[PDB]
Amino acid sequence: SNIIKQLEQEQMKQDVPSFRPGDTVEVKVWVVEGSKKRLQAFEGVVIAIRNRGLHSAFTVRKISNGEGVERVFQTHSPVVDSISVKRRGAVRKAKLYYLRERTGKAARIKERLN
Amino acid sequence: AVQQNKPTRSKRGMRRSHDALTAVTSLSVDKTSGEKHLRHHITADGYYRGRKVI
C-alpha cells in the first residue's frame, strides 16, 4: 500500500506531457536491431488513456500503409523515449473506440482551440 | 429415488441427534432498570446499557 506506492513512485517518469483523448501525439520508441539502437516514431490519435500511476497507459490509433494499427503504450516504460502533442483534439468522450468504425472524412477530429 | 427398506426408529433417532435446541447461555442485566435482556438488545421496557433509549 504505502510500501507499493513508494516502490512505484521511484520508477515514475517526471516529464510526461499533458495530453487528452483526441490529441494527435508522436511517441518515439526505442528499437534494438541487435546492437544498433534507434528511435522509431509512432504518430496517431489518442483514443484511450488509463490513469493508474506507474501502470498508466494510453492507446494511439493510426492508419499505416492502408491498415489501421493501435498501439497501447505503457506510459512509464523506458521503451517510450518521448511523447509530444502534435495537435489538440476536441472530443466529448474519454474513450474514442467509435473511431474504429470510421475512415477518412468520417474519422476527422475537430481541433481544440484552447 | 426412494428407500428399499423402512429405516428404523433407531436410525431416525440417530439423525435427530443434532436437532436439539441450545438455550440462551445467559441473560444480561441492565445496570439501571435491573431488567434481564438478551445481550446487545434493548430491554422490554426500552432500556439499553442503563439509558432509557426508547
Binding site: 528499437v31 536491431e33 509512432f42 499505416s64 500503409n65 492502408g66 491498415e67 489501421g68 494499427v69 493501435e70 498501439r71 497501447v72 503504450f73 505503457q74 516504460s77 523506458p78 521503451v79 474504429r100 | -
Partner: protein, 123 residues
C-alpha cells in the same frame, strides 16, 4: 489468434485475396496461430492471372492479427484485420514479390527475412 475456419486477408501480391486457415501447424491439439506462426490455408478468393488459384492448399505465415502482439514492457500492437503471407508448401518461402501494409518485429528471423525486407513498415 487464428484457428481452423478463420478467414485472413493476404498481405502480398501472390494473387490470393481471401484465404481460410485449415490447420494450425506445430503441435498436437494446438489451438491458435499468432503473428509469426505458419498455418495451412485454402484459397477462397483470388484475382485472375495470379500466381495462385482458388482452391489451392498451401502454407502461410500470419503477419497481422486483431488480437495483436505483446511486447516485453507490457505494450500491445493490434491491427484492424488478420493477414498472412502465402508460402510455398514445401520450401516455406514467399510466393509473392511485394508485401502490403505493416508487419511486426516478431517476423525478424532467418526464415522470414524476405518479408521484413519487402515490408513498407516494421513495428
Amino acid at each position: 489468434m487464428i484457428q481452423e475456419q478463420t478467414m485472413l486477408n493476404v498481405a502480398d501480391n501472390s494473387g490470393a485475396r481471401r484465404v481460410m486457415c485449415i490447420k494450425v501447424l506445430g503441435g498436437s491439439h494446438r489451438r491458435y496461430a499468432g503473428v509469426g506462426d505458419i498455418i495451412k490455408i485454402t484459397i477462397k478468393e483470388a484475382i485472375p492471372r495470379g500466381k495462385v488459384k482458388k482452391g489451392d492448399v498451401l502454407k502461410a505465415v500470419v503477419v497481422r492479427t486483431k488480437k495483436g502482439v505483446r511486447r516485453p514492457d507490457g505494450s500491445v500492437i493490434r491491427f484492424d484485420g488478420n493477414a498472412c503471407v502465402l508460402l510455398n508448401n514445401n520450401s516455406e518461402q514467399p510466393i509473392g514479390t511485394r508485401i502490403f501494409g505493416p508487419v511486426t518485429r516478431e517476423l525478424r528471423s532467418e526464415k522470414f527475412m524476405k518479408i521484413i525486407s519487402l515490408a513498407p513498415e516494421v513495428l
